[model samples]
Target: ERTDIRMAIVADHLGLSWTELARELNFSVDEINQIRVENPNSLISQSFMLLKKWVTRDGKNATTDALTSVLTKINRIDIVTLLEGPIFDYGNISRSFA
Candidate 1:
C-alpha cells in the first residue's frame, strides 16, 4: 500500500535490473528503489520487473517515434481512443533480442 507492493514482487520474480526496471516503470531510479525497500511482499512486482527486458536499442526508438507518427497519422482525422491501444503497444516495444 505504501510503495505499490505489486511492483516490488514483480521486480523480484522477474529478476529485473534496478536501472532497467525503473526505466520501464517510468519511475526515477530513486523511486523504483524506494518502492522495493518499501514493499517486499507484492505479487505484481514480477510483471513490473519483467518490463525491464523490454528496453533495448531501436526498440526504444520506436516508442519515441510513435508519438510523432501517431500525430502525423491522425493529423486531420477526428480524435479518438482508437490510437491509444496501438500507442501503448508500441510504447512497450523492444527488439534487442529479437
Candidate 2:
C-alpha cells in the first residue's frame, strides 16, 4: 500500500511509469513489482541509504548537490523542506565502568 503510493509519487515526479523507473534504477520489472516500501532492500531503500550518508557528513555540500540535481530533474523542489536531518545517528561510544 504505502510502497505502491510512494513509488507512484516518485514515478510521477520523474515523469516515468513504474516500468520506466525500474529501468532507470537498473531494476528489473519483476524486482520493482516485488519492492515493498519498508522492505529495507528495495531500490528506493538503496537510494536513501546514500541519502543518509550524504546528510550526516561533515557538510551539506553533497547533500544540497544531490538534492538539487534530483529535484530539478523531477521538478519537485517544493518538497525540499522535508529533506532535513539524518535518518539515524549512532555516534561513537566506548564502554566504561560505572
Candidate 3:
C-alpha cells in the first residue's frame, strides 16, 4: 500500500524545503541546487521522491538505492542504510496536514 503525494506536500509535511531535504539526505547545499529542475526527475528529485514514499508510508519497505548512492558519493558509508534504519522514524515525524 503506497501513494504518490506531491513533492511539495511531502516536503511541507516534513517541514523541509528541497535544500533542507537534501541536507538531511547527506547532500550538500551546492549539489542539490545544481540539479534543481521544474519537473522533479533529477537524481536529487528522485531521491526525495523515494524519501517521500518513506515518510508517507511510515517507512515500510521504502527503497533507498538512489539516496544511498548519493550518500556513498559523499563518503558517508556509515549511513548508507539510514533511510531504512531506525533513525528515520517516519511513523512519528510531523505532518503539515492530513
* Candidate number with greatest TM-score: 3
In model 3, what lDDT does residue 5 have?
A: 36
lDDT of each: 0.38, 0.36, 0.44
Q: What's the best-to-worst order under TM-score?
A: 3, 2, 1
- Tell me the alpha-carbon RMSD of every candidate: 13.6, 11.6, 10.0
Instruction: State the TM-score for model 3.
Output: 0.30
In TM-score terms, candidate 2 sits at 0.28
Is 1 or 2 the stronger prediction by lDDT?
1
lDDT of 2 at 55: 33
Please provide TM-scores, in order, for all candidate models, with all chains considered together: 0.26, 0.28, 0.30
What is the lDDT for 59 in model 2?
33
Model 1 residue runs over 4 Å out of place are 1-13, 40-98
Which residue pairs does candidate 1 place in steric collision? 6-45, 9-45, 9-46, 10-44, 10-45, 10-46, 11-45, 11-46
- Please say which candidate is ahead in lDDT: 1 or 3: 3
Model 3: how far residue 24 lies from native, Å: 1.9
Query: For residues 1-98, what per-residue lDDT tens digits would candidate 2 score against the true structure?
Result: 43334323333343323234234334455554444343444554544332333334423344333444455454455433233212111110110000
Give the C-alpha lDDT of model 1. Answer: 0.38
Predicted structure with the largest lDDT when compared to the true one: 3
